[PDB]
Design a protein around this ligand. Sequence first.
Ligand SMILES: *[C@@H]1O[C@H](CO)[C@@H](O)[C@H](O)[C@H]1NC(C)=O
Ligand SMILES: *[C@@H]1O[C@H](CO)[C@@H](O)[C@H](O)[C@H]1NC(C)=O
Ligand SMILES: *[C@@H]1O[C@H](CO)[C@@H](O)[C@H](O)[C@H]1NC(C)=O
Ligand SMILES: *[C@@H]1O[C@H](CO)[C@@H](O)[C@H](O)[C@H]1NC(C)=O
Ligand SMILES: *[C@@H]1O[C@H](CO)[C@@H](O)[C@H](O)[C@H]1NC(C)=O
Ligand SMILES: *[C@@H]1O[C@H](CO)[C@@H](O)[C@H](O)[C@H]1NC(C)=O
Ligand SMILES: [Ca+2]
Ligand SMILES: [Ca+2]
Ligand SMILES: [Ca+2]
Lengths: 323, 475, 98, 388
Amino acid sequence: SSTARCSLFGSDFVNTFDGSMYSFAGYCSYLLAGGCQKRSFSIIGDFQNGKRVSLSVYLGEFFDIHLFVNGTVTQGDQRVSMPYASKGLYLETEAGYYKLSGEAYGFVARIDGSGNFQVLLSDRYFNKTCGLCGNFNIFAEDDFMTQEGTLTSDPYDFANSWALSSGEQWCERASPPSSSCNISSGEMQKGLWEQCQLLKSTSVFARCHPLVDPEPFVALCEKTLCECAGGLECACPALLEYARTCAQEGMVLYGWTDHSACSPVCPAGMEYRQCVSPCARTCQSLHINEMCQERCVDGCSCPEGQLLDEGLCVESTECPCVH
Amino acid sequence: CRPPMVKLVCPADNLRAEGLECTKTCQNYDLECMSMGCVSGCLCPPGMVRHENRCVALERCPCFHQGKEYAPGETVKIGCNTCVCQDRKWNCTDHVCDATCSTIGMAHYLTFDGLKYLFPGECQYVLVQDYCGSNPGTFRILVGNKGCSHPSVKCKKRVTILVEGGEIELFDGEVNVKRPMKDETHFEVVESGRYIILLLGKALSVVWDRHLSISVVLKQTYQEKVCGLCGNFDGIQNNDLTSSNLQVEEDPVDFGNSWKVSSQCADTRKVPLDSSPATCHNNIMKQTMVDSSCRILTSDVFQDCNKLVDPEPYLDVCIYDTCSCESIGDCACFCDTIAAYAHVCAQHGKVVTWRTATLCPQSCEERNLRENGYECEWRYNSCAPACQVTCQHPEPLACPVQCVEGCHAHCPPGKILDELLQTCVDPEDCPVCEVAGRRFASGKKVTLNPSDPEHCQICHCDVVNLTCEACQEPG
Amino acid sequence: SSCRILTSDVFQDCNKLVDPEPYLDVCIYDTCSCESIGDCACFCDTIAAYAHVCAQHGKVVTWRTATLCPQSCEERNLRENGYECEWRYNSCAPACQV
Amino acid sequence: SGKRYPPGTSLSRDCNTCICRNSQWICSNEECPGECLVTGQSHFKSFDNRYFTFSGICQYLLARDCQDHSFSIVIETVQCADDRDAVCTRSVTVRLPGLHNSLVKLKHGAGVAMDGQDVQLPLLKGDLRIQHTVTASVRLSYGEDLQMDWDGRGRLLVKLSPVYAGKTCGLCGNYNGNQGDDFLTPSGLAEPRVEDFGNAWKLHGDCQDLQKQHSDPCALNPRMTRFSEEACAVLTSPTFEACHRAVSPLPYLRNCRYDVCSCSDGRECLCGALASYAAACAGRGVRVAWREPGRCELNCPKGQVYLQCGTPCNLTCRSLSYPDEECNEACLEGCFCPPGLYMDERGDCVPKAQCPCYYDGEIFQPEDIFSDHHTMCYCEDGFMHCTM
Ligand SMILES: *[C@@H]1O[C@H](CO)[C@@H](O)[C@H](O)[C@H]1NC(C)=O
Ligand SMILES: *[C@@H]1O[C@H](CO)[C@@H](O)[C@H](O)[C@H]1NC(C)=O
Ligand SMILES: *[C@@H]1O[C@H](CO)[C@@H](O)[C@H](O)[C@H]1NC(C)=O
Ligand SMILES: *[C@@H]1O[C@H](CO)[C@@H](O)[C@H](O)[C@H]1NC(C)=O
Ligand SMILES: *[C@@H]1O[C@H](CO)[C@@H](O)[C@H](O)[C@H]1NC(C)=O
Ligand SMILES: *[C@@H]1O[C@H](CO)[C@@H](O)[C@H](O)[C@H]1NC(C)=O
Ligand SMILES: [Ca+2]
Ligand SMILES: [Ca+2]
Ligand SMILES: [Ca+2]
């Protein structure tokens, strides 16, 4: 393994380093990962109202980056362009997805097109980090070590413990939102319950069951098939997180988006591949092979030809020059 | 509940039902406790107390210090004072120990009684003197800095000391006499390691690292008879800022300007108080790189000493100096602040080896290469004795410093060092003297017995000569 | 003035064969930006580079003293229980030996 | 302090005088009253003016009389935020062996209890008086050698007079004039570490022993390094220029940066730390105006108003019913209303014609004619004009 994975997917949902799911409609900034004895870094997640806005990384007390979902990035208050490489951190874009690599410090953070956050973290932090993504032992029953040092059962008085205020933010406690699904239901639920069920039935998902259970994944989707409207794409966030999990555990799974009827969003020209290499030969790259022997990565990339040139796809014949 | 203790219940007789709540153990036996009632638990008998889950049958339970257990009769050494626990409390001596000034870095001073303060100056200042109030007085030690309001590769210190009509001063890594003093017997110099140790009497001494650190050492003899930037040596720490005009100041920068020697030089300015001195001000990264390098004071090799000596004072100096100091080729405004703490650690018995090849190297190979053949006797030491025997000073001396850093010579026994020749040599080749048989120094150029003219049998010795001059009759 | 050591008395033999002005531009650039605290290395490595070039043109140079870039070598003799004393710092010694 | 003074002047260091003669000051050396201070999260000042921070969670002994046993003060600490470095004082208990061996408990809401029973103030028992204060605080006063202040939100003070010099022991120290022996533990021996010192004065064994006293809680919340550094730079600014000369700022600057980075609401930790310094300056004599709409101007109620320096002598409606009592107070800060208006039971400051009388414990109304077979009385204007 050698690494871990936390994920903050869908609306309000979280997946810890050890396989614990829980919703959290936060209203302010919260700690995701970082040492609990000595912090060389701290990954932080800012919300506006329930919905998420930014991922932040502070290095002790001297340096700060704030990548948003809208695309903007800022070192402190000054907005900066992208890419960016300062202080051992490479803020780049891999496979259409923004990346913040800190391999010196031992982490990789990326946000996708739908806004879902993700944090990969080294084994040099096993039982050595605690936060909203919990600790990194193997056990999932103890992912709620509060900041006071105590266990918990409510996900909120746990996650409210990790709130990190600022001079400008000054944030309050968060509560479970009202459930308007017990009243709003009927023929929708009977038909919409199906999309959560295929995680079990369909052959493509029917072989990660020894790797990970869909039981907590079907549980979290069914409570979100009730508020939305006009489609069946409300179940696919849970479905995508299941794929990304099984891949990290060492079983990549192909072609599950052909019939699922939920394409993950990506910009013009590129479509969602699964297992593309991060070092896609672009138009102004050196033909330097057998060096990018990194793990295969999920994401979107250009067609078979149609190389990349400044955030679009263009045929190789129209490759420009630079001076 | 278990046999070794007896159960308790709340009596309705009295509100004072002190039980399981006020559970008397060792460290809270003498102390006072609240109680709103009992917990109706099972508590030890009246004749014993809890300890580490064991209801230790006697009131002989340990006598803690530094979070460590001491059975009765065990002893500890704090300073020059042994101390022992008789019943349940430590029982220390009352021998007052020897005190020590210090110039930790460029602009900081540690008093005798123990008080770090910030005073950057560029004039000449009184560091310590006995000419204070109603005392007749014997000595007057001064310190003169130049270009040292801002710690940097500037700030060379000059030190003049006035004792017995003498004037021996020092700068540029050397000692220079300007007026020899009368009682030359007490004068004594010891050039051992990185240091010039310098003895001046039964109760006075100076220790200088040839660059910045001034550590004058005094004894019980004075005991509220001195004053200056180092204070008065009375045990009280709150009165070390009593100025020349006989009042205490709240601000150290107004204290030191009271002790300048020339009234017409500049008063150093009140700096506005900031944690980020000069160059750490706007650059928060260089304020973090300096800390993490200065957090070596709280490191694995110092953990033994961090228990005896607080590193937080010496950490404040490590940040102040090398923020202001721009180090290019001589990383010395950092390595000298850490050698100071290690010197203090060694005086409390904790020898320390903190110095490697990529951090403050301190080579010593030059004192072996000047010889045509590389004889290889000089070696750097963590902390070696400063008081040893040589061709010059063969006798044992008053040793105010147990050990010191630096390049120490070593060759097998039966061979004695000289400083004129970098190498060592057998004893008989030293220019040592023994006139009429008795053991004394290496023919010290001293007039022995001016006291009794009739018994005046004067005998000097230049290098080896078995000589005796005649005493000029007063008649 | 610290980087004017490149134009100093011990380098005069090499200043005739190799211009020091390039290596002086690097000595100013590096240790201006570099904040040196405990490891004076962003200065001592720029001067060891010029001395290495000087030695390749036959001009061996001894510029290194105890208060300027010391470079001790006593650790490779102390790890032995007895201080056998065979390792010594050398201005410029053969890299190709047996 | 870098200021010229002519010969024959007479300065005062708030306890002692100093007269200039022949360029030297002749100074008196009488002993001075002590002040041990608890404030902030876990920031302490000894009687002999040693400053330290000890974040322990237990019931600690703060001050005791240690040759006789005229009193003992015990302090109860708790973790006061999500951060582990935030440890505030919740309550303080007091023991008077001279009076029934009574046990007073000052509570977190500025309340007070004596042996369990909550009490309506004032409480003029024989020796001890407990009354409220201009700031909704509480002041205990046993005799004339012991004062205290509020442990509502955790700012206990204690005034001890010179008759207790060198005969007290606890976290506050010996009160002997020396700062160096203030880490003196109950075994008659001084410890160099603050962690080991405080863990020796705990009263309970179930409690934990603090292994580590930190100094930079901004490392665990790195989002507050900018606010903490910029918000208490006002303390080293020229807004407080008049008492940098009277009391050193740099510890109060060190306590602010620990509190704002550690506590839940740094609105009040910021404006409780700056008020800690202002109260120290005022204790010397320097009154300061550091309040602003931004820097925490408190909102006095409808009738009342902020007042930098007042007098608690003629304000309350109880003072008119008790004129022959004296007001040996100082010029205090707080919330008053203009002088013609006097406070009431329900905190409404009204004229002296609607001022009740607080005679014989009871309270009467502005024109209650009471009478008996051996006296007659009438409450006219706050004073009850009794006769026989
Ligand atoms: C959304 O993107 C815009 C683009 O400039 C940026 O100004 C903004 O701050 C982003 N949203 C939030 C909540 O910051
Ligand atoms: C995790 O660290 C804690 C704190 O030291 C320790 O008590 C515990 O045993 C560790 N757990 C594992 C799985 O190593
Ligand atoms: C301590 O030692 C002294 C030594 O004279 C002795 O007289 C005394 O009784 C002992 N007890 C204490 C704790 O004073
Ligand atoms: C340093 O000196 C001590 C005491 O003489 C000795 O035991 C130790 O081996 C020496 N080490 C070095 C580095 O010379
Ligand atoms: C020893 O002293 C005598 C004086 O009697 C003198 O003549 C002789 O030169 C001296 N010897 C040396 C070696 O100085
Ligand atoms: C190493 O230095 C010495 C002295 O400069 C020199 O004699 C020797 O030739 C150098 N190295 C070798 C072995 O060539
Ligand atoms: Ca876990
Ligand atoms: Ca003193
Ligand atoms: Ca004391």
